Design a protein around this ligand. Structure first.
Ligand SMILES: Cc1cc2nc3c(=O)[nH]c(=O)nc-3n(C[C@H](O)[C@H](O)[C@H](O)COP(=O)(O)O)c2cc1C
Ligand SMILES: Cc1cc2nc3c(=O)[nH]c(=O)nc-3n(C[C@H](O)[C@H](O)[C@H](O)COP(=O)(O)O)c2cc1C
Ligand SMILES: O=[N+]([O-])c1cc[n+]([O-])c2ccccc12
Ligand SMILES: O=[N+]([O-])c1cc[n+]([O-])c2ccccc12
Ligand SMILES: O=[N+]([O-])c1cc[n+]([O-])c2ccccc12
Ligand SMILES: O=[N+]([O-])c1cc[n+]([O-])c2ccccc12
Lengths: 189, 189
């Protein structure tokens, strides 16, 4: 069931590369994004999907050095050890066009775009979990933005929002608590 | 399958009140939110779920008059005709607390909260579609915010982000197009 699918999606930090069918994984990532709703069907989400050598390169040659250079002013090995990383961007050129076409909603499009990024990120995350793969969501933007755009020749208009690290599950999700229903749901008739 | 569940979720404007098991619907809405991820497990989403007399009141006594008063400075009947409306808020008190606790990420929490709102909105939307119910997402915020908070005695900290109108499907979804894969997915190794 759908609710079961949602419950199955969890943050998994212990990831490996025991992935049987990479093509199936790629297909599923694309489908999850494809069937995600966006304001005005604007489809502002953009993905860079890295595996193999590119996965090694992201973490060893971009994230690590950028992070070090920043801090000055382990975990990374665990991210690198995963099968791949899905970098989620929002296309600002489309956002700006929407703002120009529908001036009435100009202030709203950045908001709906952020919402869109969350939407496709978790739909992909949940779809991967259905395949039995784990993932965790990271935010090394904006530190790595320029290096990533240069290495993989991305349009300047792609604004990095998140990085979903994914692979085989090598240890179970941790414990998680939930709010009291009474504090977040009100039902009225 | 999960991808099938995603594909089944569509914007349905023609909605009615042929809903067989309201309690099951409420349970499913709660579960979809419960099992949705949020930054720091902050669970900032808040829901006001209206049906029956409250559904009539929202659209006739709040949205209509506010909208008229604004414009001065049909569709509404179609929204009212639905079984209910799920109003999605983000709790700004929790957001502000996060900003204070983790000053390093202060600018990020509003962003992750917006992403969170998108996340729970579509998870609820998709869960309703699995039950065979249709829905559409509207944005009469911030116009109706104050009236809604007063009528249902909501905390000032609840910031309205969207209103998901839902009910029985009375006409099929319209046609929808998709981008070229090549323009939004890059795969590298
Ligand atoms: C963040 C967001 C905001 C949306 N806002 C509205 C809205 O205010 N009014 C409306 O009728 N539809 C709204 N939509 C629905 C989209 O237009 C719709 O999802 C998109 O055209 C894809 O069609 P589908 O929902 O049938 O898949 C919104 C969707 C998203 C994801
Ligand atoms: C918008 C958003 C941003 C998140 N950012 C991070 C992050 O930067 N690093 C991380 O390790 N987890 C991150 N998480 C994961 C959440 O902490 C996690 O989803 C939450 O604690 C619930 O746990 P679960 O994913 O196992 O259900 C993020 C989740 C969401 C929805
Ligand atoms: O009809 N509308 O005004 C409309 C349609 C579709 N989407 O996505 C919208 C999104 C935001 C505001 C109005 C929208
Ligand atoms: O191996 N990791 O990357 C890792 C393990 C455990 N926790 O809690 C983490 C938390 C945040 C980022 C990476 C983590
Ligand atoms: O370990 N972290 O830094 C971490 C854990 C969980 N969430 O949700 C985070 C979210 C944003 C930034 C860092 C996060
Ligand atoms: O009945 N409606 O509310 C309705 C019908 C058709 N479209 O396209 C709509 C579009 C936006 C809002 C309401 C709509």
């Amino acid at each position: 069931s759908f609710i079961k699918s949602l419950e199955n999606r969890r943050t998994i930090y212990a990831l490996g590369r025991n992935v049987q069918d990479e093509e199936k994984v790629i297909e599923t990532i694309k489908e999850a994004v494809r069937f995600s709703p966006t304001a005005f069907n604007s489809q502002t989400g953009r993905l860079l999907i890295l595996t193999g050598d590119a996965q090694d390169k992201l973490w060893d040659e971009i994230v690590a050095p950028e992070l070090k250079a920043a801090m000055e002013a382990a975990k990374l090995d665990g991210f690198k050890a995963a099968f791949g990383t899905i970098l989620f961007f929002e296309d600002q050129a489309v956002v700006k066009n929407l703002q120009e076409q529908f001036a009435l909603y100009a202030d709203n499009f950045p908001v709906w775009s952020e919402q869109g990024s969350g939407i496709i990120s978790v739909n992909v995350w949940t779809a991967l979990a259905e395949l039995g793969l784990g993932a965790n969501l990271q935010h090394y933007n904006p530190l790595i933005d320029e290096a990533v755009a240069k290495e993989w020749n991305l349009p300047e208009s792609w604004k990095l929002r998140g990085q979903l690290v994914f692979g085989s599950i090598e240890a179970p999700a941790g414990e998680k608590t939930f709010m009291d229903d009474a504090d977040r749901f009100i039902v009225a008739k």
